[PDB]
Paper text:
The VPs have an eight-stranded β-barrel motif and an α-helix that form the core of the capsid, which is characteristic of all members of the Parvoviridae.
In order to characterize the structural rearrangements that may occur under various pHs relevant to the viral lifecycle, BuV1 capsids were dialyzed to pH 7.4, 4.0, or 2.6, vitrified on cryo-EM grids, and subjected to cryo-EM data collection. At pH 2.6, the ordering of the N-terminus allowed for the assignment of 10 additional residues compared to either pH 7.4 or 4.0 structures. However, reasonable electron density allowed the fitting of this loop at pH 2.6. For instance, the large rearrangement in VR-IX observed at pH 2.6 occurs at the 2-fold axis of symmetry, which suggests that this may destabilize the 2-fold interface.
Author numbering:
A (entry chain E), B (entry chain Q), C (entry chain P): 23 to 569
Write the structure that this text describes.
């Protein structure tokens, strides 16, 4: 939209075109809260490695099998793909923690039972473009950094969402979480049409993996540049840019976790109360009610009829093996905590996720990457491990035979009576919103991002540094035609949220097994070098009743 | 809301605070009907066994295995749970037959093709509280029943639905179906957080069952009393109470059953008509149309393409084994009548249900409980027995090989093209409405209750009898501190329905295999002692076309 | 004021004169919150043991010395006093936890940085008076409990505060903390003028204790009854009573604890930063600034001048030994945590306090009393142990001699430059408000109760049960003249608070060493008998900056 920026007017060289606001404000009126998140980053930008659009495919990636030693079980290591590489760089606000710090997100999840996205707004200002000049040889080598005052920054935004939306925050290409650190960008690219099909049932014994088709699909290939698609704003030093307001159309995410399964949910089995300490209740044998099958005499609560069912079984860790190669079809998130005996054995089957991140995304070390693995421990109550289930021919007063009873079947149990939950907010490293795929059936829930954009997602902000060519422009030349140039500028954004107030639903005091536990707090705080970690908090934090 | 009651004003001792209306009215205007159901019960109430809230767990219940004799197949007998027991008693209107009698529900299903819930309203009036006084020893023992005129009845309603909704009518804790009989209440309780996880694939051969975690989860436990949650109305004899109007937001239930499968549904296979008696039509061999696979020559109606598919396969009688223990994941209701050969063999696999009930719920005997088992016989046309299905590699003009054809696979076949039905109304013993679980994905249908409340369910009416303490109040005392007290009062309620008129869609006369068959009618009518049975009628009664 | 009550009108026998509201509401608008606490109790009342006002003195109490074995150090065990005993009973709302439950007080201290008292209001309704009648002898003994409908309850309130205010909640005579349990009252009494003076420096070696004067002072004695002082309302069953609104004039209590001493407070000593991990900063030797004495060269931060001083020294555990006997002169509250090495050694010297309480005040056991001992661990930063301090003759560049340096002096260090804090809210067992003593110098702070009433305290609600005399009234008779009678009625009160919103002042996440720690949570929740504990929370909970 071009625009203004920050608080400054900024006309020409020597005037600032905007200010710095990283503050977050909470506004409580009645049942509702308004969270206004301001986020401001200082962005470093280099030249595009190439001024050309490039279409190429890749290798398989590390650990992919070169033989049948593991019989194709490690073909899940396939990173093969094909892409266009666009000279443009992407500014991605979409993560939690680009916006709120650990104390703000704690404020959010304690005071709000749910939250929704309202508005987004963005500016770019205080553009500084410099060229580097090297004068010397070995020792006399001296780099001079000169302001190029007439050099241009190129800015493109998609309000129309005509470019392939890829800014999902997977791979964590997003603005850093630490307000006082600089952000380098990464260069925009998207997938083209390719076939990658791996046959893992190949061979005589059907134990061998084989490549079927791996190629780029050139006759169907869609190449859309930035230049022929969106308006590109050209900006000098005294110039600033605003996106204009964006309005989210989304659905609220609930900030509590549900502990109830169908055995926790409805009317309780008639019970004789204990009259003494250490005594237990006794289930009444003769009762009336609804059982499932022809079953009558064992009035046990397991076979009580229910209206709905909480959770569903899945072929957990499903590998798809489609066109484009194997992917994972997630399954429902839940907690393996009810089944966990050995702390050394790590049960991943609750559709758990793993965050790999770095210094600017909340790792306390450079040169290395910290990990997390959120296994969703509070989300018990959907927990369904497919091998733990069973089915039997009939439900009656009679126990089935060995041949009428089946176990370890790995069936999809999602159906019309099932009630499930999504993951919710993973605070530091999780994405905020997502684009909806344009298909006849649009997905019901999201496996990661808590907010699904009903119309468009917020437009992708693409910046490029216009090339500074030398006196001699040769068609054969690439980066020898162009002067070495880099920019620094300032991104500011404002994201507004609307929460619903959380008030106590219980008599007893709310407990917490999360981060506020101390003695671990030497990290999460800067050290003598200024290095620190950002803690994980779930969006689903306090317990709540399902029904 | 406190309130009035019945038709009487009732100021003080000696004035009646309400009247008795158990009449049901039908109002026919045009295409629509209005059913106004009045229901009035005389309610007996005793002291709370304890004035304390209690949290405890239970035993497993009867028939649960103590060993591996049945290898864990009888772990489906688990009733283990954990609950709070609240001193309050629950008044539950939610059942059919608390409202309509057998002649009213016959009037409903014959004249209406569908019905929806409109309003609910409730009153409590004519409060009588008495204390018992025993004077004598063995023979001289004499019980005197004295009016305590200043004693209080406590009434709490949830309009906000802040208490755990458990009044689903499972276990048939509901107001009785016979207008002239008294109703004892049962004491309100709900589930707390507990883990019950049974590993049935345990052991070396994976044939043994093992307890993994069985406990109460105290750190997540939510304890919500009635006193800190809702307003409690205190009522003496000359006092009455009204709930205020409740408005249902629901979806109509269809009062007909569907006999069409996908073989009954669309265009008919081109056929040569018979010209004589005892002759049959002949399917035309050379026809044009859409088949499924590469199939061409066998133009058979089985492989005709369709737009949708009626019914879905399920791992029938799925045992979940989640946190909280095993439960059943229902599957779609349908009729095993097309597959039933032996009347002695009872095929339960259509998601059939079993009602166990007693004297006030429509059993003609006290001291024993009658049973029903509704196997949904008219609901043929969804009938899908998973072992009866198959799948094959290709569909072509060629019959597949033995290795290309699979049977007895127990797969969930629910998908985007499927059309299914819920059970509908089971008249005497079935619930009317249900609460929706609060989850990211809310269930599409209900496995039992025909009406799903979109906003809240009707609030739970909880009554308690305020304790009458003796002169000496000791903290160590429980029921020795309190005078033996009981109450009788009168519940009145009005439930309004809106039906759509059913008019004849066919030339031939509608037949009926249901209850109007006589010679069984000596029951269903009182006998010389006044004992009688209430008949079962389905909400889905007359046949109708699906498409 | 006489009045109405609850929600009911209640005219005559058979109408309820009020309802039950124990709910607490939070109202968030902008920077401010409004907490409306409703509290409703069911109160048991017996006859006054005597219808007479009695003036008497007592014994010394247990553990008081009968000899010089401990040389008078155990004369701190003196409970001797003199009182009038008034036939009236006291209803005391003044405690936290009569009002809020553990989840409400957690809501308060997390969302509010400070809170103040606004209004108080009280009602009494649903009066039930009964007489007991015993008929039989040994086995035939039978107690009949009859409603006496014309019997009276007597109610007196002081809006004028003309009676000796003694309802300070010390001794924990206050309405119970559990909404669903009954409350017995205790009979009102206050001190008269007496001399108790114990000389502990008596004897030749000044090691012996001696009684100087122990007596009642009859010539100065002030006897004020309830009857000649306040209006007494007489109430039957169909009657109710309201106090009218009371408005608090008080000062807000701050809900955070301060960790800063004078070494934590102002400008920081000039320091050379560490450039590596594991390295420490280095204090700069040559700096400029203000030191205290003639001191110049050691520019150390200990001798930096400050404007104020946080905390003061005290002759900790001062025993007063005045008229009326020994008492303790408290000293400032603070935390011994910085000095605590042995967990087995309990350092009491921070003006710590000890709560002894029972079943209705948050003990999980009857027949025994639980304890707490709040030692104020977060309140480090005032911590001043008098023997740990010192003083020296001069402050210079020279270290003083052995004779110029003093230790262990036990001096009061309170003065014009000192800044201190009070304790704040001890949630379950602490008092809310207090009366100010009427003296030329009124106290600055309070050693226990967080709120000091500037004008009057809320009036004392005194109830008595009017005596039911038998046919024969003899002047010699006491309790043989009167029929055995008891009452039960319902107290309702509404207390309103105005908090100031707490918003995050820090980047890092707030940690907590308090109660939300689980694994201790099996208590604090009811058990199979319904017994549970109430947790302690401080009013000063989160950290905050002093300056």
């Amino acid at each position: 939209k071009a625009g203004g920026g920050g608080g400054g007017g900024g006309s020409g060289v020597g005037h600032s075109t905007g200010n710095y606001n990283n503050r977050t404000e909470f506004y409580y009126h009645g049942d509702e809260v308004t969270i206004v998140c301001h986020s401001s980053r200082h962005i470093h930008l280099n030249m595009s490695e190439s001024e050309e659009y490039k279409i190429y495919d890749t290798d398989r990636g590390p650990r992919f099998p070169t033989d049948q030693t593991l019989q194709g079980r490690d073909t899940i290591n396939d990173s093969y793909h094909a892409q266009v590489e666009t000279p443009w760089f992407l500014i991605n606000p979409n993560s939690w923690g680009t916006w709120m710090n650990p104390a703000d997100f704690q404020q959010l999840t304690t005071t709000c039972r749910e939250v929704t996205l309202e508005h987004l707004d963005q500016t770019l200002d205080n553009i500084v473009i410099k060229t580097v000049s090297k004068q010397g040889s070995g020792a006399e080598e001296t780099t001079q950094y000169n302001n190029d005052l007439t050099a241009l920054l190129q800015v493109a935004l998609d309000k129309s969402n005509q470019l392939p939306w890829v800014a999902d925050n997977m791979y964590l290409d997003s603005l850093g979480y630490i307000p006082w650190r600089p952000c380098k960008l990464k260069q925009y690219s998207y997938h083209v049409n390719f076939w990658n099909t791996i046959d893992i049932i190949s061979g005589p014994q059907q134990n061998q993996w084989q490549q079927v088709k791996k190629e780029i699909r050139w006759d169907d290939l869609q190449f859309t540049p930035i230049e022929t698609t969106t308006e590109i704003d050209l900006l000098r030093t005294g110039d600033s840019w605003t996106s204009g307001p964006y309005k989210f159309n989304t659905k609220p995410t609930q900030l509590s976790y549900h502990w109830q399964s169908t055995r926790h949910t409805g009317s309780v089995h008639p019970t004789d109360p204990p009259n003494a300490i250490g005594q237990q209740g006794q289930n009444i044998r003769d009762i009336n009610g609804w059982q499932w099958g022809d079953r009558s005499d064992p009035m046990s609560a397991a076979t009580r009829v229910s209206n709905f069912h909480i959770g569903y079984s899945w072929p957990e860790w499903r590998i798809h093996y489609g066109s484009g190669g194997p992917a994972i079809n997630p399954g429902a998130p839940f907690s393996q905590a009810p089944w966990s005996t050995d702390p050394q054995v790590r049960l991943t089957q609750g559709a758990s996720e793993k965050a790999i991140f770095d210094y600017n995304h909340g790792d306390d070390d450079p040169a290395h990457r910290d990990q997390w693995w959120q296994n969703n421990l509070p989300i018990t109550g959907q927990t369904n491990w497919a091998p733990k289930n069973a089915h039997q021919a009939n439900l009656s007063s009679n126990v089935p035979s060995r041949q009428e009873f089946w176990t370890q079947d790995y069936h999809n149990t999602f159906g019309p009576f099932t009630a499930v939950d999504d993951v919710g907010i993973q605070y530091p490293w999780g994405a905020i919103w997502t684009k909806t795929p344009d298909t006849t059936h649009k997905p019901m829930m999201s496996a990661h991002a808590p907010f699904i954009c009903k119309d468009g997602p917020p437009g992708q902000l693409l910046v490029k540094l216009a090339p500074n060519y030398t006196e001699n422009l040769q068609t054969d030349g690439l980066g020898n035609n162009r002067i070495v140039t880099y920019a620094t500028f300032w991104w500011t954004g404002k994201l507004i949220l609307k929460g619903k107030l959380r008030l106590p639903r219980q008599f007893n005091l709310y407990n917490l097994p999360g981060r506020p536990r101390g003695t671990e707090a030497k990290k999460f705080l800067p050290n003598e070098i200024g290095h620190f970690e950002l803690p994980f908090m779930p969006g689903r934090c306090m317990p709540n009743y399902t029904m």
